[PDB]
């Protein structure tokens, strides 16, 4: 796969600046944090639950194990 033979594109214009003319960290915190927060919130419902379940199974099983090793659980 070589540039020149990838695919067909028509009517698209792209404007760019030299890396020497611009900042490498534009609005790093001012805009970065909001974006991180957004991304974090957008996925949390899909990522976290299974791990919460793991936590519950983990704490439940460990406690159940200890309790079972003593005279009066």
């Amino acid at each position: 796969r070589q540039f020149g033979h990838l695919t067909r594109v028509r009517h698209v214009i792209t404007y760019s600046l030299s890396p020497f003319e611009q900042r490498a960290f534009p609005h790093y915190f001012s805009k970065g944090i909001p974006n991180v927060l957004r991304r974090t919130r957008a996925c949390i419902l899909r990522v976290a639950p299974p791990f919460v379940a793991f936590y519950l199974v983990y704490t439940w099983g460990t406690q159940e194990f200890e309790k079972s090793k003593r005279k009066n659980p």
Binding site: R1, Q2, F3, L6, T7, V9, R46, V47, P49, P50, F51, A53, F54, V57, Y58, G61, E64, F65, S68
Partner: protein, 365 residues
């Protein structure tokens, strides 16, 4: 050039795409530290353990090369599992050749790390050699013969240690050749990306964009490796391997290396010899079936909520199995492990393909 410099790459691949180069680095690191350790290691059972302590105590910087090799093997697996997870989530497995070679790579690295762990001839070395080679005894009619043939005798002994040094020595170079083939098949298609949509309309050159990003990734890998080597070299290891091998006694709380714990939990959950071995083999080989189980009209899970939820359930389940593998075969761990083992195969064989079909329906195609 054109295999690197002007290689076309998607403009949007994320950090999850850094693990391939990190695996290459883990491989080089293991080969370099490995060769240097091999310059001072002797494979006779009377002197193996001794030669390792000699490396760590008297060879200049022998200790750092050794712990870099030990912890490097752990980093290798962390990266391997991240690499496979990326593939499942983004549908990279549709690159069939690349994917199946990858499965071979996973098995070869597992076999390679197994044999290396046997080399210092500590307690875990010895019992690991015993158990794992014995998996072959599940093969009907000839299984036991295969095991004795591998051992070079009726039990793990000198003949075993010496050939394992040889196998462990050459296998990584074979892995390197297989990895080059892995990349060649990949180059025929170029990389997949987070969207699962062809990126031919927006390719950028690998250099300088990903060369610098890979270097940043390499730096982070080295930080993680060195935090372990310089601040907690034994954290991911097992104290029992600091005890020389004793053929008359298996430690009471013997457990596998952490990266093998999930598979060990699965095998332990089945109270049948052949059944446990078949489940173990299948827990890895099922990766070869993923492509045939793809029902979604879309390649990646990025736009598939239900599939994502089941994907993280699988990761959480492997985390559960890893934890269970580290616990004694007692209540309620026996049952939690059996459920987790069943859930593993159920998510892959039934729930995910089903979520794929439901999502298609919801999109009306």
């Amino acid at each position: 050039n054109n295999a690197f410099i002007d290689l076309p790459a998607p403009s949007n691949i994320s950090s999850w795409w850094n693990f391939g180069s990190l695996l290459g680095i883990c491989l080089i690191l293991q080969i370099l530290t490995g060769l240097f350790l091999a310059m001072h290691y002797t494979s006779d059972t009377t002197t193996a353990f001794s030669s390792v302590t000699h490396i760590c105590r008297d060879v200049n910087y022998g200790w750092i090369i050794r712990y870099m090799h030990a912890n490097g093997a752990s980093m290798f697996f962390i990266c391997l599992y991240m690499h496979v997870g990326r593939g499942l989530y983004y549908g990279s497995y549709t690159f069939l050749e690349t994917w199946n070679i990858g499965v071979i790579l996973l098995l070869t690295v597992m076999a390679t790390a197994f044999m290396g762990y046997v080399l210092p001839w500590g307690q875990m070395s010895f019992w690991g050699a015993t158990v794992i080679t014995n998996l072959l005894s599940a093969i009907p009619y000839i299984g036991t013969n295969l095991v004795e043939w591998i051992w070079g005798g009726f039990s793990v002994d000198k003949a075993t240690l010496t050939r394992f040094f040889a196998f462990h020595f050459i296998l990584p170079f074979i892995i390197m050749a297989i990895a080059m083939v892995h990349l060649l098949f990949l180059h025929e298609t170029g990389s997949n990306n987070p969207t699962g949509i062809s990126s031919d309309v927006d390719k950028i050159p690998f250099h300088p964009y990903y060369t610098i990003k890979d270097i940043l990734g390499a730096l982070l890998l080295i930080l993680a490796l060195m935090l372990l080597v310089l601040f907690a070299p034994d954290l991911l290891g097992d104290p029992d391997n600091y005890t020389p091998a004793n053929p008359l006694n298996t430690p009471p709380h013997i457990k596998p290396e952490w990266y093998f714990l999930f598979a060990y939990a699965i095998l332990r959950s089945i109270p049948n010899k052949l059944g446990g071995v078949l489940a173990l083999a299948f827990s890895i080989l099922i990766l070869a079936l993923i492509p045939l189980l793809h029902t979604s009209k879309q390649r990646s899970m990025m736009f598939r909520p239900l599939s994502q939820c089941l994907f993280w359930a699988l990761v959480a389940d492997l985390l559960t199995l890893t934890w269970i593998g580290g616990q004694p075969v007692e209540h309620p761990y026996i049952t939690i492990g059996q459920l987790a083992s069943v859930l593993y195969f159920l998510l892959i064989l039934v729930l995910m393909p089903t979520a794929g079909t439901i999502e298609n329906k919801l999109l009306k195609w």
